[PDB]
Amino acid sequence: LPESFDAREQWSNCPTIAQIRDQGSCGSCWAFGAVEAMSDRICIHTNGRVNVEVSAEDLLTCCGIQCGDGCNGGYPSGAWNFWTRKGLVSGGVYNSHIGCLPYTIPPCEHHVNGARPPCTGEGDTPKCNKMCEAGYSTSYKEDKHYGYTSYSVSDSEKEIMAEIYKNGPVEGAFTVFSDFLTYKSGVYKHEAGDVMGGHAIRILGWGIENGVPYWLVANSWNADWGDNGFFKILRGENHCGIESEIVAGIPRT
Amino acid sequence: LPESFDAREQWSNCPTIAQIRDQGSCGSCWAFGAVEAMSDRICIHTNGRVNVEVSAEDLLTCCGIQCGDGCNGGYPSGAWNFWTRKGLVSGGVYNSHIGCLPYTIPPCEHHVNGARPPCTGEGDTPKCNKMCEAGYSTSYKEDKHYGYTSYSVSDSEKEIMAEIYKNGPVEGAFTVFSDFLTYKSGVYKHEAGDVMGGHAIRILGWGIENGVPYWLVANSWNADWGDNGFFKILRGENHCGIESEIVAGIPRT
């Protein structure tokens, strides 16, 4: 395995890999890390042939109890199961009008200052509506993309790197302390700060910074939070549980 | 797989299986659900020839960063990793004077009106003394029991059932709402209450009670909580994430 590896470069023909979304005022990181990683892997596994943005909106709103409580939180491995059974329709970002169900919850500022309204944290979960927006070419049922398999990856550094390196970014989760909120650059090691619970992400690579090993991670807090929306978190120490809750899956291709 | 299965009935020569512990005023769920299931599995693996209580004190104090943060919470899969790498010693309950390092934190009342002192928030992780209790036959080192492998079990009802049936109890985890705390009997389905966090537990069976499928689970809040320290929780719909974070492991021979 390589000492450093970036999925964005390994499959540069696959643009979802490089994309930072914004979940909005809805705690649906669980839904975002999955559909981000599923998009990436539908592109990787058809070798470029198929490139969709999988709908964050379909997952979030139509999964139900097996996934969690929507905007209030949920479970990654419930998401990848849903994909495998009921599939996910396409849906681009808010107001993109791309795909069946683009996301209906607007961008907002996530522990940063900018032009977008502050995020407000409390946000209703949209009802499940099994219908593509007006204009879309196909019907909801037709637009479903399916998972062939889902699985957890064991807490093994070398096993996590081999899975990404072979098959694409993963969804993971980690415990979020308050000192993470203000990450700008470099490798995140939790030091000060209290605990704000566990949070799901997409892991898309690894590398070495000043000797400190790290994981290259996409947050779903828009591109103005952190390092253009990405963060590096310390690798090899189960640091804040980052090597504990890896889930992934192979598309029905 | 049978309609129902109890690890206690199946490996009745192994008494740790039926045993309930008390973690005291220390959020070390992660440690208990581990060392309970390893105890069972050492006993099951050896056909009962080896019957020890794996020390919750050793794992809690000596694991370090990879397991999380001691009495403030931690990660199950780091526990089982450490077990395969460093091993874990014998240690009975508080004042048991059984084994190398019994537990040094005393029993207390977890959300129930009994006679032990109420439990005193969370505590402070002890230091790691790599020395057994004065009076113990063997050295710390000579007292280590090693895991051969540790691994995550995927979010699959049938998979999780087959693992328990073939290898014995597993550690799991789930989100806790306020309405859990006053469980007495029957099958717990979350209907109301505030979140409190995900907490680690040991799963040791399943069955059906009045139409509803469940998991037989052991809490580490002593025997005056719940149904003799035990509870049942809805099975088959990833309820409070119960099927999402399953870890386990094989004892070294």
SS (H, E, C) chain B: CCCCEEHHHHCCCCHHHHCCCECCCCECHHHHHHHHHHHHHHHHHCCCCCCCCECHHHHHHHCCHHHECCCECECHHHHHHHHHHHCEEECCCCCCCCCCCCCCCCCCECCCCCCCCECCCCCCCCCCCCCCCCCCCCCCHHHEECEEEEEEECCCHHHHHHHHHHHCCEEEEEEEEHHHCCCCCCEECCCCCCEEEEEEEEEEEEEEECCEEEEEEECCECCCCCECCEEEEECCCCHHHCCCCEEEEEECC
For residue B204, the cross-strand partners are none
Chain A residues in contact with B243 by the CB 8 A cut-off are 77
Q: How far is Cα B63 from Cα B35, in angstroms, rounded to an integer?
A: 13
To the query of whether residue A219 is one of the catalytic residues in this protein, the response is: yes
Rg (CA), chain B: 17
Catalytic residue among A100, A132, A145, A219: A219
CB A253 within 8 A of CB A47: no
The resolution, in Å, is: 2.1
To the query of whether residue A199 is one of the catalytic residues in this protein, the response is: yes
Residue A72 is classified by DSSP as G
CB B216 within 8 A of CB B204: yes
Q: How far is Cα B7 from Cα B15, in angstroms, rounded to an integer?
A: 10
Number of Cβ within 10 Å of residue B163's Cβ equals 19
Rounded to an integer, what is the distance from CA A236 to the centroid of its chain?
A: 21
Q: Which of A66, A197, A245 sits opposite B238 (nearest CB)?
A: A66
Per the structure, the complete domain to which residue A245 belongs is given by 1-253
Q: How many residues does chain A have?
A: 253
Q: How far is Cα A230 from Cα A20, in angstroms, rounded to an integer?
A: 8
Rounded to an integer, what is the distance from CA B2 to the centroid of its chain?
A: 24
Q: Which residues contact B113 (CB under 8 A, 6 or more apart)?
A: none
CA of B75 vs chain A CAs: smallest distance (Å): 6
Q: How far is Cα A58 from Cα A89, in angstroms, rounded to an integer?
A: 6
Catalytic residue among A26, A132, A145, A199: A199
Number of Cβ within 10 Å of residue B20's Cβ equals 20
In the numeric block, which tokens belong to residue A54?
């999988």
Rounded to an integer, what is the distance from CA A116 to the centroid of its chain?
A: 21
CA of A96 vs chain B CAs: smallest distance (Å): 33
Residues A193-223: b if buried by 16+ CB within 10 A, e if exposed: eeeeebbbbbbbbbbeeeeebbbbbbbbbbe
CA of A137 vs chain B CAs: smallest distance (Å): 34
In the numeric block, which tokens belong to residue A196?
């704000």
Domains: count for chain A:
1
> CA B34, B193, B223: angle at the middle one, nearest 5?
40
Beta-strand relationship, A230-234 and A195-209: unpaired
Q: How far is Cα A43 from Cα A53, in angstroms, rounded to an integer?
A: 10
Relative orientation angle of helices A76-85 and A29-45, to the nearest 10 degrees: 50
Relative orientation angle of helices B76-86 and B29-45, to the nearest 10 degrees: 50
Burial of B124 (0-12, 13-18, 19+ CB in 10 A): exposed
Chain B residues in contact with A151 by the CB 8 A cut-off are 154
User: SS3 of A203, please?
Assistant: strand
Cβ–Cβ gap A153/B152 under 8 Å = yes
The approach used to solve this structure was: X-ray
Cβ–Cβ gap B239/A65 under 8 Å = yes
Q: How far is Cα B79 from Cα B59, in angstroms, rounded to an integer?
A: 7
Beta-strand relationship, B230-234 and B187-188: parallel
Rounded to 5 degrees, φ, ψ at A245 are -130, 50
To the query of whether residue B199 is one of the catalytic residues in this protein, the response is: yes
CA distances from A103 to A60, A62, A100, A150, B19 (A): 10, 13, 10, 24, 50
In the numeric block, which tokens belong to residue A96?
């993109």
Q: How many residues does chain B have?
A: 253
In the numeric block, which tokens belong to residue A39?
């998009």
Q: How far is Cα B12 from Cα A201, in angstroms, rounded to an integer?
A: 43
Q: Which of A216, A217, A215 is CA-nearest to residue A237? A: A215
Q: Which of A77, A197, A244 sits opposite B77 (nearest CB)?
A: A244
Q: How far is Cα A249 from Cα A71, in angstroms, rounded to an integer?
A: 23
CATH number at residue B4: 3.90.70.10
Q: Which of A163, A232, A249, A228 is CA-nearest to residue A18? A: A228
Q: Which of A19, A52, A41 is CA-nearest to residue A138? A: A52
CA distances from B153 to A113, B95, B156, B179, B192 (A): 42, 35, 8, 27, 29
Chain A residues in contact with B78 by the CB 8 A cut-off are 155, 238, 241, 244
Number of Cβ within 10 Å of residue A64's Cβ equals 15
Q: How far is Cα B61 from Cα A96, in angstroms, rounded to an integer?
A: 52
Q: Which residues contact A59 (CB under 8 A, 6 or more apart)?
A: A31, A34, A35, A67, A79, A82, A83, A88
Catalytic residue among B14, B29, B132, B240: B29
User: SS3 of A30, please?
Assistant: helix
Number of Cβ within 10 Å of residue A43's Cβ equals 22
Q: How far is Cα A95 from Cα B178, in angstroms, rounded to an integer?
A: 39
Q: Where on the phi/psi map is residue B238: left (φ > 0), alpha (ψ -120 to 50), or beta?
A: left
CB B223 within 8 A of CB B20: yes
Chain B residues in contact with A80 by the CB 8 A cut-off are 155
Q: Which of A78, A195, A238 sits opposite B66 (nearest CB)?
A: A238
Cβ–Cβ gap B241/A68 under 8 Å = yes
Residues B53-92: b if buried by 16+ CB within 10 A, e if exposed: bbbbbbbbbbbeebbbbbbebbbbbbbbbbbbeebbbbbb
In the numeric block, which tokens belong to residue A32?
């975002």
Q: Which of A75, A155, A247 sits opposite B238 (nearest CB)?
A: A75
Cβ–Cβ gap B150/A152 under 8 Å = no
User: SS3 of A116, please?
Assistant: coil
Relative orientation angle of helices A157-167 and A29-45, to the nearest 10 degrees: 50
